[PDB]
Amino acid sequence: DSELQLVEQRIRSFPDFPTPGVVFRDISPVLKDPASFRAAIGLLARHLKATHGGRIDYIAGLDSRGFLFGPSLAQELGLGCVLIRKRGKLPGPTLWASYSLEYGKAELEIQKDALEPGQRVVVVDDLLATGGTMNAACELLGRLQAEVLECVSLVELTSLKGREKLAPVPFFSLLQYE
Amino acid sequence: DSELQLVEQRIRSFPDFPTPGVVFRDISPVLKDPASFRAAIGLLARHLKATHGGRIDYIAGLDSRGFLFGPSLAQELGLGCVLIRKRGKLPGPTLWASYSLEYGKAELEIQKDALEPGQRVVVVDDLLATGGTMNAACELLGRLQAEVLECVSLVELTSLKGREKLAPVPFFSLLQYE
Numbered sequence: 001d002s003e004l005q006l007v008e009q010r011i012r013s014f015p016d017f018p019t020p021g022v023v024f025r026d027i028s029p030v031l032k033d034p035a036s037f038r039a040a041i042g043l044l045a046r047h048l049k050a051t052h053g054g055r056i057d058y059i060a061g062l063d064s065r066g067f068l069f070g071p072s073l074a075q076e077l078g079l080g081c082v083l084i085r086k087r088g089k090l091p092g093p094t095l096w097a098s099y100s101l102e103y104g105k106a107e108l109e110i111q112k113d114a115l116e117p118g119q120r121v122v123v124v125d126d127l128l129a130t131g132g133t134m135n136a137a138c139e140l141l142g143r144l145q146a147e148v149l150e151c152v153s154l155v156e157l158t159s160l161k162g163r164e165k166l167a168p169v170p171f172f173s174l175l176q177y178e
Numbered sequence: 179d180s181e182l183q184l185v186e187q188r189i190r191s192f193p194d195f196p197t198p199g200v201v202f203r204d205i206s207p208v209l210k211d212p213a214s215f216r217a218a219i220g221l222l223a224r225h226l227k228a229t230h231g232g233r234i235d236y237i238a239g240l241d242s243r244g245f246l247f248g249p250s251l252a253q254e255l256g257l258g259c260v261l262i263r264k265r266g267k268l269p270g271p272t273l274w275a276s277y278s279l280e281y282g283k284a285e286l287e288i289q290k291d292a293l294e295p296g297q298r299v300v301v302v303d304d305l306l307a308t309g310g311t312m313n314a315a316c317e318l319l320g321r322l323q324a325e326v327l328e329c330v331s332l333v334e335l336t337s338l339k340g341r342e343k344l345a346p347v348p349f350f351s352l353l354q355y356e
């Protein structure tokens with residue numbers, strides 16, 4: 001797919017970042033090349049419409065890199081975007097959920113009125129690694145009695161088995177690296 | 179202006195967050211209402227085209243809330259978006275710039291290869307308060323020899339004199355509160 005190639009060729013892979021042996025997949029060049037960004041958003045939107053039809057009510061974008069994609073994806077689908085943030089950032093009543101990040105723990109948070117019970121959401125982030133971040137997002141959304149139809153990302157690091165961590169919630173990525 | 183009203187009516191104010199006496203202007207409902215989000219992006223894009231014609235090379239979006247607007251604004255203008263991040267997040271050689279956040283210090287960071295000398299940039303963030311964050315972004319861009327044509331936000335807190343802090347760099351906000 002030439003569209004997918006426009007995204008793939010704009011992923012920059014940095015070895016030994018942040019630690020030796022780990023390859024960092026930098027999406028910055030996708031953002032910097034408007035054709036690449038448009039392609040990525042288009043491919044995600046097409047997948048989501050083909051898979052869910054009119055079922056999606058909202059996109060949820062994950063703080064922080066997921067914010068780069070959530071609003072554009074929502075816009076392309078004619079939907080709003082709700083936010084899931086690192087804890088401490090959002091005003092008003094919230095729920096929060098811990099997850100494991102590198103060597104310690106972190107928490108995500110959502111405003112209690114972000115969604116109503118029964119609303120259907122797709123979560124977007126830039127990259128799925130261990131699945132911890134996305135899993136915390138799904139937990140929060142479930143606690144608002146929202147239905148998570150799918151999680152999606154531009155990049156998936158398949159050797160880390162994030163897909164399995166999210167099951168039974170469906171997952172889709174544009175690009176896969178071991 | 180009904181377009182501007184679509185944005186204004188989706189700002190939610192929270193007293194005493196995160197500290198007593200201040201009012202947090204929550205842009206979440208702008209993101210959640212696709213018409214509101216489209217209006218905000220459109221108003222910013224129209225202003226920028228009206229003020230700079232075709233001279234803008236890139237949008238720079240600021241981590242984290244600014245990420246919600248940078249790519250969409252860039253896309254509307256047919257431009258790429260470059261990233262300025264909280265320090266520690268970007269791979270490759272970087273520059274960083276400290277600024278005063280609440281009671282302590284934070285740092286923004288940019289990849290050394292993010293822009294070439296002479297390239298023309300408009301910085302976008304959700305909110306201008308003291309101007310510390312935006313000012314740090316301008317410092318980083320200037321240290322890459324980029325030309326900052328303008329900084330823009332959805333919300334400006336005028337009593338904090340952020341505009342003055344940025345001068346002589348032009349600034350534009352959609353909405354103003356004390």
Ligand SMILES: O=P(O)(O)OC[C@H]1O[C@H](OP(=O)(O)OP(=O)(O)O)[C@H](O)[C@@H]1O
Pocket residue numbers: 062063064065066101125126127128129130131132133134162267
């Ligand atoms: O699948 P996981 O193992 O949880 O890792 C994936 C997450 O890691 C990165 O975010 P990071 O926490 O580095 O924060 P950022 O958004 O501030 O870059 C990335 O943007 C994902 O959100």
Ligand SMILES: O=P(O)(O)OC[C@H]1O[C@H](OP(=O)(O)OP(=O)(O)O)[C@H](O)[C@@H]1O
Pocket residue numbers: 089240241242243244279303304305306307308309310311312340
């Ligand atoms: O003009 P200033 O006084 O610098 O304040 C404005 C900045 O403050 C907020 O960011 P915050 O640091 O709260 O981080 P966030 O983007 O993670 O919410 C806001 O999104 C601006 O970036």
Ligand SMILES: [Mg+2]
Pocket residue numbers: 062063064065066133
């Ligand atoms: Mg992240």
Ligand SMILES: [Mg+2]
Pocket residue numbers: 240241242243244311
């Ligand atoms: Mg910010």
